[PDB]
Design a binder for this molecule. Structure first.
Ligand code: 1B0
Ligand code: 1B0
Ligand code: 1B0
Ligand code: 1B0
Ligand code: 1B0
Ligand code: 1B0
Ligand code: CL
Ligand code: CL
Ligand code: CL
Ligand code: CL
Ligand code: CL
Ligand code: CL
Lengths: 209, 209, 209, 209, 209, 209
């Protein structure tokens, strides 16, 4: 990544590398994997981002979907930012493929990211990757919120956990009280109805405790 | 977070990230998880705080209660601190949503936290989160102190552990001798009665050892 | 804690935090936990010390005894050092509750600890905590030294280990040859008697090997 | 490796050393081992690269293939860059065997890598090694893409994972929609045929979900 | 410990603390524990050395022998270096109890160790401790070298391992070919006799392979 | 070790210490242990090298062979470099025993290693140790290359792994195609014969796949 000390390039650490590999091995593409990726790739160059994605073994259906998303965003970038035999020793303008690190060198990437003003190719590429990762999360979300209904003897708290877990995956962690009540079991629904509208989640959970 | 070297921004470390994820996985929302969160988020930006909260998988009923608490505190902040097309290159005043990191950039957050004098948006947001976490702890406290009574053959020490464990959860670690005696078993109660008032916990525990 | 680079404040590390939590989980309040706490809290602010104590789940009977000890020492501090509407921008004198971190801010704590000359509130508070921890160790010491006697077929070395383990807990690691001999079994006692007085532990152990 | 602070030599870290040894022990020569090697050997001298390769126990058939590849590339380097009793205290030009670290000292390697302009012998040697590693990956790829066909009751997602896993190994992670459809089972093939051409992978996977 | 940056005091690290605790837990007082202690206590103050010794739970017979050894060496130090109401703001001369850290403060210890010329109280105290540890190792050595004899079907290599393991413990790793031959089994003894004198260990082991 | 910042002495790290102990515990004296030792002892003083060797428990037959090798090399050093009551405050010339750290202090070792020009006693001693370690590896190599022959149903790849593993141990990783073919089973030998001479290992392995 690029870090302070002056802004200088640093090697990706074994700790960072292992942390990413392990979270994928344990969590696959549960929603919480996205903010972990984002956090672990803080200051990342496009090379660093490709490194992290490449260290993943398996999950290749998802990674191909990721590739396709990246290619679309790169095509759109080029449409919005067309580049014009470059002047000797001068910084060239990055194309989509340069941002994704397929046609740019590390030194070029460092040049853009540390320029004044910077062309933040690390942040732009991360944005495309996170967009692709959110799509994978939505695809792999196993259950519709319509099918999350409280069991006859399921504690209300356990039901609320499932409801908001499902909502998070279906929306890729991007921001329902009435539906929560509607999908509650008849005993807790009666109690929640009696609370009326404007009840907080805390109050609803206390009531069905 | 923001740290010294001059006050500069640093990437959240994999060690910090993993420590938070693991403590939640092992301890859920036992009271001791709060001071761990506070300690692990030392110097945290609002982005860092959202990162830590987002890395948590599951417990989504609690996180939604947390969200609601944050939104209330943000609404109250705006009521107390209304903001007035900003002057070119000047620092704007943070709204509630800027403190919670939904409408502020990392650079803006860095600007407020390192300003002279600082607008400590990291500390303000942490305060709202801890307030929400304490409510979760109180909600998930399984037992009333009224039901913590010493067993006929339960060692006094074991009883005192349960009593103060329960008191801590019920009060979210925010600061009873008579009730302790009252809920003791008849043999130890007789002994403690004979000690009289003004006995320390140490003396009470020695007496029923 | 406060450390050198100039004396500056640093965030407590995840390594330190986890080390303390784990040693308590594994060793409870065996004597060796005290020097570990002292070592892990090197340079600690009162906030850091409260953090470490708060990260402990369970053992709440002991922590309440710790609280009581802290409150006594704070009351005594105030008796010895009474404080007199403070001058603008000037350092106030710490009360007992400021040293224990209940009524002082981190910035105030940093101010006292790094002042010239320093008011070492971190060291003063640690002293009160260690005093409380030593009392817990003495309370939880399961066996009197009077009951540590060598078994008929127990190796002398194994007996000496138990004797000095017990002595350490009973005295909270704060500094017997005749009693060691007296509590030895008849065969080793005969041999040790024949060595006479002035025998070192090494010589005694060699003799009953 | 060589790193910034001025460009200076640093000892390879135990963390780096162990990370490489462990990834080989767990993953052998699965494709994802290559980007891990590349990442762990960031800034590596030829000595460092030989160190990492030498710390591997077993897999000696592969390492001999690696040796042969390195020797070929070294022979080609010498053909392209012939060297001409060197001037006192002056930098000599590296031969193939100097780049591979068999006939060069660490100090010479440091001299080339930190020269102005640099002769990047660490990067040149890594390139030869990665070339050899990609060949090992292609050799050890157990299955042809022609044999990856969707099972009668195999979920489409599971099939796509195998297809792109196989494609990655066969091509050593160096960059098929029609073949994917062709190798799908009759039920999903019917559905995919009906989507027509121009369908993204996402759309194809949604359709056969 | 005291380290470079100027010679400054640093807190003992959790890594160092845990490494010492664990090596004792796993190896007790096998000979190899001594050089580990010495290495882990590099630059240690007397306080640091007491910390490390105090973090050990159990083994209290050995630690009491250690105490006695330390007290003897302290008594001898005072005999050799008698100290003479000290001049204001001046460095006092350390007594035995100051070197062992029972009557000296950390600041005094830092003063002696970083003085010009230094009074290396950390190194002097470590020397006394290692002397005591070597005695513990000799005491706990379970077997005399006279009882290490090669089994009828024991591989010569396995016998040599036991012989030199025993010799190391008996001598506390402080520096026999004829005895090695003498204690060999009749078949290997015949072969070694035929080699004659002046045979290296390598040659002897090859011969009885 | 000695490292850059100016060349200064640093304490050997707990990570380094543990890494060496563990690799020996897991790998004994498999060939790959040598480059690990070399890598872990980067910049090592003779004291550091003795530390690492001393932290090893067991394997004492091998360590005695190591001792003997070191003593021979020290004797040869003295023969080649005889030393001549030294001038006050001046650097003395190191003897063999000074290089091996038996008669030299750490400060003397630091003096030689950081002198201009340096007398690299750390590198000289490491060379003697590695020479001794290579001999141990050759001694403990369990199998002659003459006995590595492909099984009737053993995959060619598995056979090549054994062949080059054996060759590495027999030669202590110091640099056969005809012998590889000669020791292949009759079916693969027929195929390899038909390839003719000049076949690479890759081609041979593809042919017998
Ligand atoms: C964790 C989570 N669950 C969801 C369910 C449905 C939709 C989105 C989500 C999210 C992501 C989610 O909303 N995460 C929060 C952080 C957070 C996490 C946990 C508790 C409180 C705050 C976040 O990133 N931001 C910017 C945020 C902050 C305050 C209020 C609203 C949003
Ligand atoms: C740990 C704990 N148990 C409780 C039970 C009921 C109510 C609150 C709690 C707490 C939190 C709790 O009180 N923690 C203590 C720190 C502490 C922890 C353990 C032992 C001694 C001191 C704390 O944070 N502060 C500021 C404090 C310090 C000294 C006296 C009183 C309070
Ligand atoms: C470890 C231990 N066991 C005891 C039994 C009864 C009373 C006290 C104790 C102690 C604490 C104990 O005495 N620890 C020792 C350090 C130590 C530990 C182990 C071996 C040698 C020295 C200590 O802290 N100091 C200051 C000390 C140093 C030298 C002589 C006497 C005391
Ligand atoms: C991971 C993978 N699977 C493959 C299958 C066939 C051929 C090659 C491969 C690769 C390597 C692979 O292509 N890795 C990608 C990084 C990557 C990994 C995972 C998802 C998205 C991007 C890469 O290194 N680069 C330079 C790249 C970046 C964007 C588009 C195309 C290529
Ligand atoms: C490891 C060991 N085994 C022994 C058996 C009997 C007596 C002493 C010992 C020792 C300690 C032992 O001798 N350790 C060696 C280091 C060493 C360890 C292993 C192999 C080679 C060199 C040592 O510390 N020094 C100073 C040394 C160095 C070279 C020659 C002689 C001594
Ligand atoms: C790993 C190994 N196996 C062997 C079998 C017989 C003889 C020696 C060995 C060695 C040591 C071995 O040769 N290691 C290689 C590094 C290496 C390791 C693995 C693959 C490619 C290169 C090495 O140290 N050097 C200097 C080297 C580099 C390029 C060509 C030839 C030698
Ligand atoms: Cl893969
Ligand atoms: Cl979730
Ligand atoms: Cl608790
Ligand atoms: Cl091998
Ligand atoms: Cl103990
Ligand atoms: Cl040993």
């Amino acid at each position: 990544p690029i870090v302070q000390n002056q802004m200088v390039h640093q090697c990706i650490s074994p700790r960072t590398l292992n942390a990413w590999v392990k979270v994928v091995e344990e969590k696959a593409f549960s929603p919480e994997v996205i903010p972990m990726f984002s956090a672990l790739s803080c200051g990342a160059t496009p090379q660093d981002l490709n490194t992290m994605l490449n260290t993943v073994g398996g999950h290749q259906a998802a990674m191909q979907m990721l590739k396709e998303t990246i290619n679309e965003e790169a095509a759109e970038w080029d449409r919005l930012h067309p580049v014009h035999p470059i002047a000797p020793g001068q910084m060239r303008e990055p194309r989509g493929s340069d941002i994704a690190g397929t046609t740019s060198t590390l030194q070029e990437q460092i040049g853009w990211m540390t320029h004044n003003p910077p062309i933040p190719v690390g942040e732009i590429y991360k944005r495309w990757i996170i967009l692709g990762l959110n799509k994978i999360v939505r695809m792999y979300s196993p259950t519709s919120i319509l099918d999350i209904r409280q069991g006859p003897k399921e504690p209300f708290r356990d039901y609320v956990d499932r409801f908001y877990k499902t909502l998070r995956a279906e929306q890729a962690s991007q921001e329902t009280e009435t539906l929560l009540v509607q999908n509650a079991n008849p005993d807790c629904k009666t109690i929640l109805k009696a609370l009326g509208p404007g009840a907080t989640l805390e109050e609803m959970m206390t009531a069905c405790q």
